[PDB]
Amino acid sequence: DSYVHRHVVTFDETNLVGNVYFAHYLHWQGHCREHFLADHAPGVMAALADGLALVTVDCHADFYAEGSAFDEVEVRMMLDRLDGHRIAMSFDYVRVAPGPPTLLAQGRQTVACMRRAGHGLEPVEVPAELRRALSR
Amino acid sequence: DSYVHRHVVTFDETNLVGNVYFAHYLHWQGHCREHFLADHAPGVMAALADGLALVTVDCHADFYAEGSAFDEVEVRMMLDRLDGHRIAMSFDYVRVAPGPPTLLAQGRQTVACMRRAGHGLEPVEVPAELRRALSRYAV
Amino acid sequence: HHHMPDSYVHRHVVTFDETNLVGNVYFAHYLHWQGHCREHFLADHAPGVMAALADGLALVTVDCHADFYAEGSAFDEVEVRMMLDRLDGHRIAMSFDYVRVAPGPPTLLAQGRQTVACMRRAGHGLEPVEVPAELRRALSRYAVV
Amino acid sequence: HHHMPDSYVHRHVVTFDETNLVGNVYFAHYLHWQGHCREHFLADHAPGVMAALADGLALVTVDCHADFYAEGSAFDEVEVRMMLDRLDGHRIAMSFDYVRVAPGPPTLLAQGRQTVACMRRAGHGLEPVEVPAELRRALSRYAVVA
Numbered sequence: 001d002s003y004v005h006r007h008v009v010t011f012d013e014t015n016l017v018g019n020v021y022f023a024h025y026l027h028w029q030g031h032c033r034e035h036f037l038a039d040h041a042p043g044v045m046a047a048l049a050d051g052l053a054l055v056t057v058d059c060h061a062d063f064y065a066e067g068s069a070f071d072e073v074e075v076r077m078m079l080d081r082l083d084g085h086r087i088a089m090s091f092d093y094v095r096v097a098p099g100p101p102t103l104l105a106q107g108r109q110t111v112a113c114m115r116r117a118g119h120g121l122e123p124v125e126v127p128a129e130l131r132r133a134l135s136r
Numbered sequence: 137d138s139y140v141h142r143h144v145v146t147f148d149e150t151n152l153v154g155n156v157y158f159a160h161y162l163h164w165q166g167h168c169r170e171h172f173l174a175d176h177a178p179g180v181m182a183a184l185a186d187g188l189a190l191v192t193v194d195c196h197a198d199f200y201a202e203g204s205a206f207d208e209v210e211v212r213m214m215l216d217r218l219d220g221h222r223i224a225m226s227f228d229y230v231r232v233a234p235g236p237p238t239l240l241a242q243g244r245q246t247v248a249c250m251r252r253a254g255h256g257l258e259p260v261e262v263p264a265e266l267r268r269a270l271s272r273y274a275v
Numbered sequence: 276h277h278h279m280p281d282s283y284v285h286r287h288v289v290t291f292d293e294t295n296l297v298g299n300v301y302f303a304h305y306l307h308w309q310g311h312c313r314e315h316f317l318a319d320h321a322p323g324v325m326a327a328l329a330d331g332l333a334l335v336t337v338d339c340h341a342d343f344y345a346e347g348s349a350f351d352e353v354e355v356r357m358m359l360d361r362l363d364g365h366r367i368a369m370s371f372d373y374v375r376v377a378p379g380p381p382t383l384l385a386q387g388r389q390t391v392a393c394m395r396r397a398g399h400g401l402e403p404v405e406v407p408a409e410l411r412r413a414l415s416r417y418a419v420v
Numbered sequence: 421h422h423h424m425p426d427s428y429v430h431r432h433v434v435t436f437d438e439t440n441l442v443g444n445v446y447f448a449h450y451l452h453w454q455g456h457c458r459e460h461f462l463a464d465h466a467p468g469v470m471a472a473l474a475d476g477l478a479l480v481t482v483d484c485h486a487d488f489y490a491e492g493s494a495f496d497e498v499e500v501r502m503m504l505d506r507l508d509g510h511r512i513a514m515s516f517d518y519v520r521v522a523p524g525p526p527t528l529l530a531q532g533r534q535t536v537a538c539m540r541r542a543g544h545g546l547e548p549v550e551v552p553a554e555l556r557r558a559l560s561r562y563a564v565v566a
């Protein structure tokens with residue numbers, strides 16, 4: 001069961017080599033997790049203004065085949081693990097058009113749920129609405 | 137005596153055509169105005185963490201010659217006009233290396249000083265430190 | 276102003292990486308969106324031109340402009356509405372309305388303009404080429420009004 | 421004299437366009453900075469390789485990684501400190517410390533890693549090429565030690 005974020009590669013994501021510059025794959029992880037929040041946990045999205053922080057702990061990408069301008073890429077996100085305050089997600093980046101389905105890359109990211117009164121910020125349980133959305 | 141912001145073109149600013157993607161020239165206006173504040177208006181720089189915001193009203197670029205990866209570009213900023221709450225700046229983008237000095241592009245931008253209130257962003261006076269810095273260091 | 280556009284529409288959802296500490300969309304992103312919009316237009320309405328862009332054709336930006344009216348925020352749905360202003364041998368002048376369509380009422384965030392030249396990479400640098408017929412026809416049919 | 425090996429230092433000042441509404445540096449910018457750092461390294465220490473990158477040589481990223489420890493802010497002066505982890509054939513593994521050096525006390529913001537492969541454009545694809553001697557030479561001055 002994966003969450004699909006659809007992304008069309010633009011010229012500004014390419015580079016003189018002719019492929020998608022590597023760092024854009026990490027932005028797409030972000031676009032995907034944020035679109036998930038908006039689609040299935042809007043209350044957590046709203047809570048980000050209040051006092052909830054979703055902080056990136058780490059991220060990773062493995063690159064397999066080159067993406068090009070106008071490629072339609074599915075950024076397929078899965079829950080790898082939820083533990084107290086941390087959420088680990090994994091990502092397949094699959095070109096679905098043009099040509100045959102092609103795995104361009106894979107990735108991983110961990111996010112921590114924090115609350116931040118005073119000066120520092122402290123771990124808080126993954127919110128219920130988010131925990132609920134994540135299981136589906 | 138324009139204010140000079142030096143920028144080395146990186147691969148992530150290029151594109152498959154082989155040149156600097158046009159929209160990066162606009163980011164460089166931002167980089168240049170921020171570097172200007174750190175150099176010449178550090179009190180204003182501090183107010184930007186304390187509720188002051190520089191809000192873009194308009195911007196413009198004219199492109200003359202292609203930029204490439206590893207080009208050293210001088211983003212040369214000049215003050216065009218100050219009013220109550222607005223600053224108009226102009227920019228020459230000059231490749232200084234490799235090869236001979238080459239005007240790649242020119243640009244313009246108007247910025248407003250704003251503070252965030254209950255309704256949203258509201259106009260405030262340009263701080264005197266910034267008006268003086270621009271009149272002295274970007275003319 | 277209107278929910279319904281009369282122009283070519285490129286839909287864009289604002290992401291967190293397009294915001295900045297002020298809390299709005301950083302101004303330079305609006306210029307990227309002109310590029311995203313014109314590329315989406317090619318894929319929708321001039322796919323033969325899209326293919327020529329891998330075969331020596333280049334769209335070179337001559338100039339661009341934006342006027343900013345109201346702030347954009349993360350997760351705003353923005354319509355980047357593109358209209359043909361002028362077609363002149365090898366140059367295309369296009370205008371843009373940036374309309375927030377959600378949340379809240381339709382709001383003009385910004386307007387913009389851009390001139391692009393159709394060029395081919397040659398043994399002289401870049402050389403002007405006439406606007407491809409497919410693109411000229413697509414712009415007259417999909418980006419007028 | 422220097423027990424710990426030196427690292428290559430790429431200086432980066434955080435700009436507003438690298439921040440986000442949360443108020444910190446958006447995480448994906450740290451990966452761009454690896455790119456900026458490795459390119460600045462080539463311009464400083466392997467300029468012949470830098471020229472070959474306009475002449476058909478390409479550095480192709482195989483993988484990359486970042487661990488985030490403390491928030492970066494607009495106007496922070498960040499040193500992106502690069503070291504060679506290993507050179508394995510046509511592949512180069514580099515590691516990165518991201519250290520805020522101003523304002524305030526030196527602060528480790530993040531660490532990172534990246535593997536790159538040296539390739540050349542053949543047809544419509546790329547093929548492995550040996551790491552150029554100049555680049556091998558330049559990276560070995562910043563080797564991580566056991």
Ligand SMILES: C/C=C/C=C/C=C/C=C/C=C/C=C/C(C)=O
Nearest residue numbers: 033034036054077078079134291
């Ligand atoms: C099955 C997929 C589950 C995905 C869970 C996604 C969680 C994403 C959290 C995103 C947080 C983003 C935070 C900011 C500040 O950008």
